Amino acid sequence: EVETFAFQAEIAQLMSLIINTFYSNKEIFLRELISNSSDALDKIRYESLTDPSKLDSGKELHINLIPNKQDRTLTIVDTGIGMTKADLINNLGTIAKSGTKAFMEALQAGADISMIGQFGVGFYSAYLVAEKVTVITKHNDDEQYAWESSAGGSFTVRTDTGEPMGRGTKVILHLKEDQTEYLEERRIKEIVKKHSQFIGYPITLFVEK
Ligand SMILES: O=C(Nc1ccncc1)C1CC1
C-alpha cells in the first residue's frame, strides 16, 4: 500500500532549482545530510536525559556512511530520533515552506547557495547528486516507514517491510551516473574532513569488498 503525495509548490520549486541550476560545488550535500543526522542524534540524546527508556531502541549514537558501487548508492545511517509518518509527510520534519522562503530572501540579500542548511532545508541538497532519494525511518512513537522521491513534483510513503532499524534514519542516495566519485573512499574521506571534521558523533565510513 503506497501513498503518493504532491510536494507543496514552494518545495517543488526549490527542488527544481537544485536539480537544474549549474553549480559545481555538489559535494556539500554530504555536509548537509551529516549535519541533519547530528541534529537528530542531539534530539534523542536530549530526550534520554530525563527518560532513559528512550534508548531502549538502541543506546549507540552514531553515523555510518555506506557506499555500494554495485547498486550505485551512498547511504547515510544515523541512530537519531527518527521520524513519524506525519513527520515524513510534513517535509521530513522540516519547516520547508518558511525555510525555502527565508533561503530565497537571503539569496536576494547576497547569501550564498551553500548556506542552504541555515534555513532548515539542507536535506534537499541530496538532489545535487541523487536522481532518487529513499528515506527509511523509525521513531519510537511510530512504525518503520519508507519515503521516496525522484523529484518531478511527488513523493511516496509506504510501510517498510525491510530490515528493522531499531531507531533512526537511513538516507539512501541513488546517485546520478556522472556522480559516482562520491562512492570512492578517498573522496568521501576528503569531504568529511573538509566539512564535517568536528561533528560530535562517530562517523564510520564503510569499505567495500
Ligand atoms: O540550494 C541549492 N541551489 C539553488 C540554486 C538556485 N536557487 C536556489 C537554490 C543547492 C545547494 C542545494
Residue 154 Cα to ligand 1 midpoint, Å, equals: 19
> Structural domain of residue 155, as residue ranges?
2-50+59-205
* Residue 45 · residue 192 · CB < 8 Å: no
Q: How many C-beta neighbours within 10 Å does residue 184 have?
A: 12
Ligand 1 pocket member 100 (CB < 6 A)? no
Residue 61 Cα to ligand 1 midpoint, Å, equals: 31
Q: Which residues pair with 129 in a beta bridge?
A: none
Ligand 1 pocket member 125 (CB < 6 A)? yes
Q: Report the domain count for the chain.
A: 1
Q: What is the CATH number of the domain that holds 99?
A: 3.30.565.10
Alpha helices in 1-27 (DSSP H): 9-20
Q: How far apart are CA 96 and CA 79, in angstroms?
A: 23
Ligand 1 pocket member 17 (CB < 6 A)? yes
CA nearest neighbour of 45 among 65, 62, 64 = 62
Q: Which residues pair with 68 in a beta bridge?
A: 73
Full DSSP string of 131-179: EEEEEEEE-TTS--EEEEE-STTEEEEEE--SS--SSEEEEEEEE-GGG
Mutate to test the pocket of ligand 1, among 21, 108, 121 (most ligand atoms within 8 A of CB): 21
Q: Residue by residue, what is the 3-state secondary structure of 78-89?
A: ECCCCCCHHHHH
Strands 2-6 and 73-78: unpaired
Which three cell numbers, joined as nine digits, stand for 194? 573538509
Q: What is the resolution of this structure in A?
A: 1.6
| Beta-carbon contacts of residue 161 (< 8 Å; ≥ 6 apart) | none
Q: ∠ CA(138), CA(143), CA(145), 5° rounding?
A: 65
